[PDB]
mmCIF file of C-alpha atoms in Angstrom:
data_model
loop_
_atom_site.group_PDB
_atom_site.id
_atom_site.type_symbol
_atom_site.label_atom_id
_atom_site.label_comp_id
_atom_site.label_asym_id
_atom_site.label_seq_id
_atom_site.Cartn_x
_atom_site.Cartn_y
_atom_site.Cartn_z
ATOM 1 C CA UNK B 3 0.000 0.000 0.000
ATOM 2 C CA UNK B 4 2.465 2.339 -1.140
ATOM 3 C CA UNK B 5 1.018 6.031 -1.494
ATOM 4 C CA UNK B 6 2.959 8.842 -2.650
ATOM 5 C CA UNK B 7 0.039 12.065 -2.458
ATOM 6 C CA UNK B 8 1.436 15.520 -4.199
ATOM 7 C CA UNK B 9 -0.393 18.863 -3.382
ATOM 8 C CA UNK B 10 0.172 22.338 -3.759
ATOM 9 C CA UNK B 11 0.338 22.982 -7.517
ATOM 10 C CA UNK B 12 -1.096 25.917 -8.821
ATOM 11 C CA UNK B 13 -0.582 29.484 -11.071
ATOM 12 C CA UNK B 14 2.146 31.405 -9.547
ATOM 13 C CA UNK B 15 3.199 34.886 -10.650
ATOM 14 C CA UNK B 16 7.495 34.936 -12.216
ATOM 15 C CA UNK B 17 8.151 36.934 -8.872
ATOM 16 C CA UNK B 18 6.586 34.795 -6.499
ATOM 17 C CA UNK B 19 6.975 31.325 -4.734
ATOM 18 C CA UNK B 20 5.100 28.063 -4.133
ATOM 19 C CA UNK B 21 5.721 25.171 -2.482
ATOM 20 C CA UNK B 22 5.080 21.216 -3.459
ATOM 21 C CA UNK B 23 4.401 18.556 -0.954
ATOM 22 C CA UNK B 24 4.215 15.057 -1.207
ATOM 23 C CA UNK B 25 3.034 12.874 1.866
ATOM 24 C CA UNK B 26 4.407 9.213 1.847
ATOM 25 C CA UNK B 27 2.531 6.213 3.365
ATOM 26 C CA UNK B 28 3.215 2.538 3.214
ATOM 27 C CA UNK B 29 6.843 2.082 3.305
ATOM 28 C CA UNK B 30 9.604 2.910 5.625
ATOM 29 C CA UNK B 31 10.321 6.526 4.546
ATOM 30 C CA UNK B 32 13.134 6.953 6.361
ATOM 31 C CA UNK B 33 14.710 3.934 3.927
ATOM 32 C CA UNK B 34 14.619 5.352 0.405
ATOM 33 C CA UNK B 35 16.037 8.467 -1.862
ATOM 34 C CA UNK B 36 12.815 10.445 -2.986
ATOM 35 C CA UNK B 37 12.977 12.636 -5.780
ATOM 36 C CA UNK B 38 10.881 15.009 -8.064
ATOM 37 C CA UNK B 39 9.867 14.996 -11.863
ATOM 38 C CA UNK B 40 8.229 17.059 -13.978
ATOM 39 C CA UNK B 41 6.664 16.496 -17.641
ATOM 40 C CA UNK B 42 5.381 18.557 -20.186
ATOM 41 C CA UNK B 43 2.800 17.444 -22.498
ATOM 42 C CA UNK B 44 4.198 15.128 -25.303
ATOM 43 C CA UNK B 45 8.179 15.571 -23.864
ATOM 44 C CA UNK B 46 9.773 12.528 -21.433
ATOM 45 C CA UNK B 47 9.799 13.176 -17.648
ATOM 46 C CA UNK B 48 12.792 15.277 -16.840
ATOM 47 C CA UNK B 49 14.494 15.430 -13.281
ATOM 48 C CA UNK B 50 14.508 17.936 -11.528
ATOM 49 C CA UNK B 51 16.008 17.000 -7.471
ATOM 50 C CA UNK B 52 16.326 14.375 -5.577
ATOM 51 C CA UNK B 53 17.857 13.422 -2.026
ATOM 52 C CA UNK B 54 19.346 10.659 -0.139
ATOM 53 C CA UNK B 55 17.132 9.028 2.860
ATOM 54 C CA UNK B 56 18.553 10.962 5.788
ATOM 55 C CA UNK B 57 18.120 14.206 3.223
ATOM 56 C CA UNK B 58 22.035 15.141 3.975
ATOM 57 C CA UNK B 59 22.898 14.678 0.577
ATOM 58 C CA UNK B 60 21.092 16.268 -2.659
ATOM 59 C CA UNK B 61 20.908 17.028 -6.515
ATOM 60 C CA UNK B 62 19.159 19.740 -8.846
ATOM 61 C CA UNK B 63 18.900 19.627 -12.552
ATOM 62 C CA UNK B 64 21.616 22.250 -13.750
ATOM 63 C CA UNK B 65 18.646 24.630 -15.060
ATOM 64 C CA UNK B 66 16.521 24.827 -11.595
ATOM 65 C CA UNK B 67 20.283 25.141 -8.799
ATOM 66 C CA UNK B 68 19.705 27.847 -6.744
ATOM 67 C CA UNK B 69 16.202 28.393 -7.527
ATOM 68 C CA UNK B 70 14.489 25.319 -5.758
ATOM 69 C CA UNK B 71 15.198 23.743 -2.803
ATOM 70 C CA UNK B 72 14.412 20.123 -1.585
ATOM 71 C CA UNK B 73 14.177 18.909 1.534
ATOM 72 C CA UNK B 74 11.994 15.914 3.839
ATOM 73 C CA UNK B 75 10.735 15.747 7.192
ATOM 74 C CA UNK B 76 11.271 12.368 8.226
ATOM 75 C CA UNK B 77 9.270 12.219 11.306
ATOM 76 C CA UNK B 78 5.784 13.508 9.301
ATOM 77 C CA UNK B 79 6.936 11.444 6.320
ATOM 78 C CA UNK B 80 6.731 14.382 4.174
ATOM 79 C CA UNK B 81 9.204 15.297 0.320
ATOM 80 C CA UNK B 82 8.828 19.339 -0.551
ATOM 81 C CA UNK B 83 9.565 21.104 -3.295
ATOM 82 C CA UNK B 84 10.335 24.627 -2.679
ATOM 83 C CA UNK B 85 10.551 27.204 -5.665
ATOM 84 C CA UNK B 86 11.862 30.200 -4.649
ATOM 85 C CA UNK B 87 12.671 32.051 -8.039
ATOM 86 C CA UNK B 88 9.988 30.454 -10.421
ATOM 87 C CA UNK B 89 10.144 31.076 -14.098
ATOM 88 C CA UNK B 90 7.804 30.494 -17.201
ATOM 89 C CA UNK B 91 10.239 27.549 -18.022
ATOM 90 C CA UNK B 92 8.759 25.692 -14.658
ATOM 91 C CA UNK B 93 5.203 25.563 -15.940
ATOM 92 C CA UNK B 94 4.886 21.754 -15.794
ATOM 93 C CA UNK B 95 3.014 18.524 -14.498
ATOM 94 C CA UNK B 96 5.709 17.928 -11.021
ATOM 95 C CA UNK B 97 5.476 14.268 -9.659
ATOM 96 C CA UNK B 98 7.060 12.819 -6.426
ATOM 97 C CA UNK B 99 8.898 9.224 -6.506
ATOM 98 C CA UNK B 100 10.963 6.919 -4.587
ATOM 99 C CA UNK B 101 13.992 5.799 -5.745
ATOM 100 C CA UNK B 102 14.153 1.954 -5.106
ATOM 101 C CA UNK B 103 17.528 2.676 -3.148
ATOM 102 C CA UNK B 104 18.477 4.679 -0.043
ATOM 103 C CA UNK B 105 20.375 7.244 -2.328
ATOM 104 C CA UNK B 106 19.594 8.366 -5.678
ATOM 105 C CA UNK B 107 19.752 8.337 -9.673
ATOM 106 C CA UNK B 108 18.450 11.075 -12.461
ATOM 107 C CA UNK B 109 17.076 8.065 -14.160
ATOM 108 C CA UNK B 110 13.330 7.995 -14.026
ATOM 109 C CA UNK B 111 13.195 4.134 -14.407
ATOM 110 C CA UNK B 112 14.749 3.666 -11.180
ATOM 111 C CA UNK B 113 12.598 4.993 -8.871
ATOM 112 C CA UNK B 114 9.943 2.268 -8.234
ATOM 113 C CA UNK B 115 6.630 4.357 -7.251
ATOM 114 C CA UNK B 116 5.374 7.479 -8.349
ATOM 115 C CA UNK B 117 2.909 10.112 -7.580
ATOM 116 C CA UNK B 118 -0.319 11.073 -9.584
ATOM 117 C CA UNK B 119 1.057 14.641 -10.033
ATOM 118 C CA UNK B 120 0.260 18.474 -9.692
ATOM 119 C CA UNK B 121 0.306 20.964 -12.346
ATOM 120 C CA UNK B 122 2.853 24.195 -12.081
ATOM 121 C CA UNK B 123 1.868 27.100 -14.252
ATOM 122 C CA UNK B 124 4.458 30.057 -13.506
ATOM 123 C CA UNK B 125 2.359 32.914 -16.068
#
């Protein structure tokens, strides 16, 4: 019964910020590398960060460093996606995963369970 549930997509202004979460259930979160995806229509799913389980270690797609931030809370089993400095660029469907190890990988086919998603539209 592995759920990974992502909320807080929405339209967000070039100067503003918005924040993703994505509550994990039904595995032992403190165990697994999460990351998040994003996809726009007709285009391949295209990393964007991920982090090891403690959430000492982390990655960014080149285009989004210093702009978002990810982090976990592993007491309320929790992944976030913060975007600071959102641009038109971002507008896109993000989705949470787990990798299937405790660190992670920019390669979409190895994280084993995915989220159902939440659209980004920076205007």
């Amino acid at each position: 019964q592995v759920q990974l549930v992502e909320s807080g997509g929405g339209l967000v202004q070039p100067g503003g910020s918005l924040r993703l979460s994505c509550a994990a259930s039904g595995f032992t979160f403190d165990a697994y590398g999460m990351g998040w995806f994003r996809q726009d229509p007709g285009k391949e799913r295209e990393f964007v960060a991920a982090l090891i389980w403690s959430g000492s270690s982390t990655a960014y797609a080149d285009s989004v460093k210093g702009r978002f931030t990810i982090s976990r809370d592993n007491a309320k089993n929790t992944l976030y996606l913060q975007m600071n400095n959102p641009k038109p660029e971002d507008t896109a469907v993000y989705y949470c995963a787990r990798h299937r190890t405790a660190g992670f990988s920019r390669r979409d086919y190895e994280y084993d369970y995915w989220g159902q998603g939440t659209q980004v539209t920076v205007s």
